[PDB]
Write a structure and sequence with these properties.
part of a larger assembly; 5 chains; A little secondary structure; B alpha+beta; C mainly beta; D alpha+beta; E alpha+beta; C: mainly beta; four-stranded antiparallel sheet; 12 strands; 22% strand; E: alpha+beta; four-stranded mixed sheet; 4 helices; 4 strands; RNA-binding; Ribosomal_eL34_CS (chain A); Ribosomal_eL34_C_sf (chain A)
Chain lengths: 77, 65, 234, 86, 94
Amino acid sequence: SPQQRSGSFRKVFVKLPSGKSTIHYERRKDNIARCGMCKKPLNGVKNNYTYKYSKTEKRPERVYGGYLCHKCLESLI
Amino acid sequence: TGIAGRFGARYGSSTRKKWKEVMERRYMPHQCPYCKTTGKVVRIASGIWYCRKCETKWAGLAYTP
Amino acid sequence: GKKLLQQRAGRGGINFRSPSWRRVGPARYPNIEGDHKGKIIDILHNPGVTAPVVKVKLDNGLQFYIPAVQGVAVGQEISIGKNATISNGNIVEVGQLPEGTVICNVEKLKGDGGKFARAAGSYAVISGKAGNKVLIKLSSEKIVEVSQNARATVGIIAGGGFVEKPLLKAGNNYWKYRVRAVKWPVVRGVAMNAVSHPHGGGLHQSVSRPSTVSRNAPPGRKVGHIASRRTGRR
Amino acid sequence: AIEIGRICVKTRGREAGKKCVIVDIIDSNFVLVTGPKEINGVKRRRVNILHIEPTDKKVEINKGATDQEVKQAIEQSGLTDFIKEA
Amino acid sequence: FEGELKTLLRSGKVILGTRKTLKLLKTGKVKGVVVSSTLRQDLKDDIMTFSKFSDIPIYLYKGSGYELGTLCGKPFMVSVIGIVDEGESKILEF
RNA sequence: CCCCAUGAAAAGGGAGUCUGGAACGAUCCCGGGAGACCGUACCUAGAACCGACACUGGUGCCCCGGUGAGAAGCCCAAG
RNA sequence: CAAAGCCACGAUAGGUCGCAGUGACCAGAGGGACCUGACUGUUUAAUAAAAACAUAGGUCCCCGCUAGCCCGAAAGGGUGUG
């Protein structure tokens, strides 16, 4: 139950007028979605720990917009 | 001793000499077979190389392309 | 006495097994029955095997790994089958090749995956023809005899010059055997006691008998030079 | 090449694959295109020379033709359905 | 070929580089184009596609962009050359 | 930058492209309902754990103004 | 950049006291010669830390894979995703 790297330490006092100090533990940042062989996550695509339920806010508006840019694609159509 | 001077006075003069001649061959300026010497070639692992300009990866020897 | 180390190594305990879950996969030919075409999609490092492997995609969508051949690039197109031409990386049949052609990863039958000339830098040449079979000279200088329709790859396994750089210290050899099954470090048998080795015991460390032993010695005794025809440097 | 009335395909953008007709030339980098009756109806806009891929099909119209003039000319060669044949 | 290229650059007008000469090819304002054999594949088949739409001579150079750049005297590589004015040389018949 | 080291796997997430079906209909706003079961006191150690003991041993991990290079030696806050 | 306020480091000139200025604290005695193991590492938990073990380098032997070497009473198995 001591330290574990799978959690980042934060301490807060700048934007702060009350008077105490403590420590908050949050999980490390995510990344643009995963498996791998073609290996390029994208531009304009969104990854968040929770989901704001967004639909077009988390993907571009081209033909294959969320899948990948025009790189690993045209041998699929 | 050249590049082998990072060992100090260990391992023997002739053993350090053989190690040094192999490394000096690896770090020569190599020419890409595909584009040309434009972007320099680097080693990923033993037998795996690529050129940093054309992004082409190929298979070669252990310490030279 | 007590069981030797080689006798303990045969029970296959975790100290003597291979940590194979760390490799990409078995590097064998697949069972296919046509004249296909493939594309190399990656060149990878196989942890304890000494040769890099390529990943191949067939036109019907089949994935497999084979040992890489020197001079093959990613995105290159290769052909598989009896009608394949003589080019690096192509999987051909040994019945169709002329004399003195350098190949590697040679099968013995049709559909075993490849047996000979797989380690880094090794290759075989075509050295003749028997009535039903072709004669292939291996890197040990011996001659082996394989089927007419055994598949092989054209070229030399990548990773040569592997052994021209000295390991230079005991720790460079400590990793090398972390991903292999070889036991390291190695204790001399003369340094043991008489209960643990036929060479052990005595005031002065020495092999007490001649080292050469027969082919019929029971297990627990085959140490030293095994059924040697000759000894000495010359 | 890039000339008046050539049928083209837009390589990128929102539609990115739908077809259009070149009506006139603006400058050395931009041309004006239109697709009258596409599935979404790509509208009269300029486009960069690098963003369209030419086809072998042409239409006989004059420089700076209106939206109706090209619409009739498509029917003249019966290309109204033949846009999505290639 | 080198004999005409020496005269072409002495008196004619020339364009060095892919981007500038690729736009002129689409609008049909280049007399001819020479391509080195080491050019990127995506750009090479773009040259070949747009050339059939305008009947422009295309010459395939055997060497790379480095000994094509050295022929022009330019200190770095040139992979595509666009010929916009022959000048007085006799290169355009190839 | 380095390796004769190339440095886990899955459930669970999101997206894309197609096929079939109905004309009603949300990944957006507003209001309402629901979310089993089990742990949770205290010590965590020169007196709460193991060593016959309120045993100078072992089992712990994580954190903390002056002089000074310093988490050292010396002096002192909060406790 | 230059000015202003804070801050750090490196130097200069003069004056001065003590037995003593890294004033306490912290904090290497040095040199010449021979044997031995090359080196970093390991070991007799509770009388032996070494010149013993290992090591990198060297060299020899078996074996073309339905092999060589080893485990099992058998079915079979480890090296071997080689």
